Write a protein that binds this DNA or RNA. Structure first.
Ligand code: MG
Ligand code: MG
Ligand code: MG
Ligand code: MG
Ligand code: MG
Ligand code: MG
Ligand code: MG
Ligand code: MG
Ligand code: MG
Ligand code: MG
Ligand code: MG
Ligand code: MG
Ligand code: MG
Ligand code: MG
Ligand code: MG
Ligand code: MG
Ligand code: MG
Ligand code: MG
Ligand code: MG
Ligand code: MG
Ligand code: MG
Ligand code: MG
Ligand code: MG
Ligand code: MG
Ligand code: MG
Ligand code: MG
Ligand code: MG
Ligand code: MG
Lengths: 150, 91, 155, 81, 144, 129, 25
RNA sequence: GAAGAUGAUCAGAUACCGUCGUAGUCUUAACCAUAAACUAUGCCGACUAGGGAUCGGGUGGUGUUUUUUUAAUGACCCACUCGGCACCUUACGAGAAAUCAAAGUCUUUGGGUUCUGGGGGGAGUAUGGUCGCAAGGCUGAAACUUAAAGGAAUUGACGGAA
RNA sequence: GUAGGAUAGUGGCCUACCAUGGUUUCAACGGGUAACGGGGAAUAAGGGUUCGAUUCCGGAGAGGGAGCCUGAGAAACGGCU
């Protein structure tokens, strides 16, 4: 529970029992897929595509309504990013904290949280390199990371 | 490689002068020989030019400063205080 | 291995007692001696058709594979025609009814019929002493995919 | 209570329990057919909808995100599912 | 999980942990440091002959009140000086100054016994004619 | 973290049987749990148990009747040769006339008695008595 | 004897011991 | 306000008390790396018992307050729920007991893992290494000595305790 | 690694020329051993703990080192230098 904290919170989605769903859905799977691809052409993270499909449209689960996950649809349509989504959103946080620290050198807990974020980055990047999503000897060097995530 | 463990720039002084004195001069010979960033052109090209003079090699602009740093803490406090008093006077 | 400077040494590299007659031009160019190492170890077509010599090769050389047939993960290809393999195992301490991870580093001669790198599972076979530490030849390489085809960059 | 039916708990108990701590975990959220006073079209809005949802034809905000359920705003009408 | 590791491949941690905590015993520490040979005047042995230097009378510890009638014995095999209790009624009349006694330990593997302070050995024989046998009446002590 | 769902299941069964409940609920319901419970039910230590299929890992409601003293897990699953099953039974079981040491054997998950009748042995799971 | 002050006594004994050891060495 | 100065008292000459007062207390740059750093209670996970109160978030009342002819949002009430700091009753259980919803699920002994202890002293000493400008910090014995040291509770006695 | 020499023969065993490797927290390397290794022995709930110079097997040695002769076999010591 909370690998870098002491929180024990259970705050998750509880997806339904129905793996084929939800019988008021009158849009087609290919229309959902081209809406997904349109959102990725706009430049959206798969989490942001899924939240927009869920709230604006009736797409409860894209895995249920299509046959495929959102990142898998984007990979099949050639829209996978160079580093994965959660790793990119971790490196973005790490470079923001480091940019803060270069001004506020006295910020000892920002130093501590930066160590936590890099430890989390290295564990995630190690997983991605063993599952071969990232290239081997991909390294977060924390000096080129600002240009790695712009 | 790492040529010296801890003397650094004061390895030129040899064994002389005392270790505390060589430490005290090391912490200021690093400071007076460091390249500082220019407040006018952004490049790290400010060098010291006979203490109190700090000249940028790009854009050739010279600022008065401390004897071994460009901005002493007393001067930065003075700058903040005069900014505060000017903002209080002209408003 | 039909290239990269076979005659790179001060001596003429040839298989001993294999004679290329210059008076009668042979129907097959540069007669080569090979053998099957035995034990179901297929002689590779690079060993059959190559131009290398390697007197310690188990297929074209003068060594014979006999004895133990081990298997190990390559940890070092940093020698010339010799690799170091890791033979990891588990040792049982009978007091605690438990095991401990152990490993042994076995230096193995590799023929230039085989292209090996760090990570490959190789099958090695005992021969006569090749060098001070080497008593094994690589007879089989058991890494074809190795999960090394999807790591490359995309558009 | 030392003896109870754990395969068929009462619906009043299962509607009290947390969405993960029921017999089979499912969501308590839902979807809404929402129409504006102005436009005739229907938009399917999540209950806990996280987003200022608009129509495709409208310029009007249908729901405003909050900590839990989205607040359906400005006199629009809704129906469940 | 009750402290220790339990897994099947965790035998090295258990073995080295027992090896590390094994040193807190008295006997294992003593036996693996080899303190019986480095120290402890009889160099790992049971008995040792020495030469009496002087008869001592040790004050017994409180609350006992007696003179304990020991001897100061210089061991032949080491040259170490020890104090040895002459362990019966009389029997200090039987030893001498400057003769050869056999000493044994005194019951407690070191650890000076009873009310005798700092005496951890005892005289078994004097001149090779066995103080118990001299004490009963059984043998006569040789004159040389 | 959760390292042994069989240990969690059997702990829940023991804790409800100690307090006298006639049923448990067990999450997250492995095949080893189902086979262990089938051996226990075959020997009469539990009643009917029912597998709730949520689409994630399953739950089980076991009907404990009254006849269980201690079901437990021997973790780690020690390798058990056929000669030292009887050390394990002499250590874990209250008597030679009842109680079963459950083995994972390549002929299936089974108790020690019909591990002996099939002349097979293997890893140890736990016990029931 | 308070353990704090016996500790301070032994700490002063440390200083005297290393002073005489540096004196000889 | 350490040190230090000074005033009183005291048998010895209570160091407590009064008045000053350096370092210090504060801050910047660099060190140190320890506290009864305590919850004297490692971290993750599961289960076992009732209760109310509270903090944060969420959900539901055709609830109260804004009574304005079917009165937004906040605040409040009630019931749930998740997460938290804790608390009260009991002892299923545990414990040598004090006590503990964990210190329970332990001779019916095995969920995962790290660290530590092996009678009291000698001794956190000697020495070696390493870190520090130093103070010291981390690591850390042995010879020797000793029959108890200690923990919890009971009865008594005693208190410049009520 | 290549080639030679040497050997009864493999082999950095040695030589010549190249390459820069090889072992290590799964404890290398070093230090101690009042350590020859094993079959075995003592104690025996089970697990263990401790001993094994010693009647059998293997090694090593003949006061310490070194070198060799003869011979199938020795770096032999009731052989030599
Ligand atoms: Mg959790
Ligand atoms: Mg962690
Ligand atoms: Mg060679
Ligand atoms: Mg401490
Ligand atoms: Mg503590
Ligand atoms: Mg931790
Ligand atoms: Mg709560
Ligand atoms: Mg002790
Ligand atoms: Mg210490
Ligand atoms: Mg020291
Ligand atoms: Mg205490
Ligand atoms: Mg007490
Ligand atoms: Mg040759
Ligand atoms: Mg050769
Ligand atoms: Mg050479
Ligand atoms: Mg020896
Ligand atoms: Mg016993
Ligand atoms: Mg032996
Ligand atoms: Mg022997
Ligand atoms: Mg001997
Ligand atoms: Mg022999
Ligand atoms: Mg010999
Ligand atoms: Mg002799
Ligand atoms: Mg000799
Ligand atoms: Mg002969
Ligand atoms: Mg000889
Ligand atoms: Mg002789
Ligand atoms: Mg002989």
């Amino acid at each position: 529970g909370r690998m870098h904290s002491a929180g024990k919170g259970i705050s998750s989605s509880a997806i339904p029992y129905s793996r084929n769903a939800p019988a008021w859905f009158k849009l087609s799977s290919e229309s959902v897929i081209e809406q997904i691809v349109k959102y990725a052409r706009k430049g959206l993270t798969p989490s942001q595509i899924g939240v927009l499909l869920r709230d604006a449209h009736g797409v409860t689960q894209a895995r249920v309504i299509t046959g495929n996950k959102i990142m898998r649809i984007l990979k099949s349509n050639g829209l996978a990013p160079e580093i994965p989504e959660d790793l990119y959103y971790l490196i973005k946080k790490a470079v923001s904290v480091r940019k803060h620290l270069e001004r506020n050198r006295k910020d000892k807990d920002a130093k501590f949280r930066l160590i936590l974020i890099e430890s989390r980055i290295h564990r995630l990047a190690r997983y991605y390199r063993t599952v071969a999503v990232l290239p081997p000897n991909w390294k977060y060097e924390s000096a080129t990371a600002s240009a790695l995530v712009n | 490689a790492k040529r010296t463990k801890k003397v650094g720039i004061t390895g030129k002084y040899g064994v002389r002068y005392g270790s505390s004195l060589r430490r005290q001069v090391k912490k200021l010979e690093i400071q007076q020989h460091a390249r500082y960033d220019c407040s006018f052109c952004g490049k790290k090209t400010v060098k010291r030019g006979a203490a109190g003079i700090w000249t940028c090699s790009c854009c050739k602009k010279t600022v008065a400063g401390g004897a071994y740093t460009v901005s002493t803490a007393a001067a930065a406090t003075v700058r903040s205080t005069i900014r505060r008093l000017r903002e209080m006077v002209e408003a | 291995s039909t290239e990269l400077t076979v005659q790179s040494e001060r001596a003429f590299q040839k298989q001993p007692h294999i004679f290329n007659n210059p008076k009668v031009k042979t129907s097959k160019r540069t007669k080569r001696w090979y053998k099957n190492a035995g034990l179901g170890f297929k002689t590779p077509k690079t060993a059959i058709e190559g131009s290398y010599i390697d007197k310690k090769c188990p297929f074209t050389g003068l060594v014979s594979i006999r004895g133990k047939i081990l298997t190990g993960t390559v940890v070092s290809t940093k020698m010339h025609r010799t690799i170091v393999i890791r033979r990891a195992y588990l040792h049982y301490i009978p007091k605690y009814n438990r095991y401990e991870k152990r490993h042994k580093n076995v230096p193995v001669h590799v023929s230039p019929a085989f292209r090996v790198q760090v990570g490959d599972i190789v099958t090695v076979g005992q021969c006569r002493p090749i060098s001070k530490t080497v008593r094994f030849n690589v007879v089989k390489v058991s890494a074809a995919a190795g999960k090394a085809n999807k790591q490359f960059a995309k558009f | 209570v030392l003896v109870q039916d754990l395969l068929h708990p009462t619906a009043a108990s299962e509607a009290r329990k947390h969405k993960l701590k029921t017999l089979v975990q499912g969501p308590r959220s839902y979807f809404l057919d929402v129409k504006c006073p102005g436009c005739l079209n229907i938009t399917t809005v999540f209950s806990h909808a996280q987003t200022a949802v608009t129509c495709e034809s409208c310029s009007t905000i249908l729901c405003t995100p909050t900590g839990g359920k989205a607040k359906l705003s400005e006199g629009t009408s809704f129906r469940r599912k | 999980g009750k402290g220790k590791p339990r897994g099947l491949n965790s035998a090295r941690k258990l073995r080295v942990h027992r090896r590390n905590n094994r040193w807190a015993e008295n006997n294992y520490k003593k036996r693996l440091l080899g303190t019986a040979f480095k120290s402890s005047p009889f160099g790992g042995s049971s008995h040792a002959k020495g030469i009496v230097l002087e008869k001592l009378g040790i004050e017994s510890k409180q609350p006992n009140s007696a003179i304990r009638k020991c001897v100061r014995v210089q061991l032949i095999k080491n040259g170490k000086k020890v104090t040895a209790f002459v362990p019966n009624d009389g029997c200090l009349n039987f030893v001498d100054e400057n003769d050869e006694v056999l000493l044994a330990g005194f019951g407690r593997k070191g650890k000076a016994k009873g009310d005798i302070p700092g005496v951890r050995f005892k005289v078994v024989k004097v001149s090779g004619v066995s103080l118990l046998a001299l004490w009963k009446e059984k043998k006569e002590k040789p004159r040389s | 973290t959760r390292s042994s769902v069989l240990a969690d299941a059997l702990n829940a069964i023991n804790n409800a049987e100690k307090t006298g409940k006639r049923q448990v609920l067990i999450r997250p319901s492995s095949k080893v749990i189902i086979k262990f419970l089938q051996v226990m039910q075959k020997h009469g230590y539990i009643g009917e148990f029912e597998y709730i299929d949520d689409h994630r890992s399953g739950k089980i409601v076991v009907q404990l009747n009254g006849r269980l003293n201690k079901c437990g897990v021997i973790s780690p699953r020690f390798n058990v040769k056929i000669g030292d099953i009887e050390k394990w039974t002499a250590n874990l079981l209250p008597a030679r006339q009842f109680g079963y040491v459950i083995l994972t054997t390549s002929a299936g998950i089974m108790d020690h008695e019909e591990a002996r009748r099939k002349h097979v042995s293997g890893k140890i799971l736990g016990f029931v008595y | 004897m308070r353990a704090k002050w016996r500790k301070k006594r032994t700490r002063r004994l440390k200083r005297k011991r290393r002073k005489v050891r540096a004196r000889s060495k």
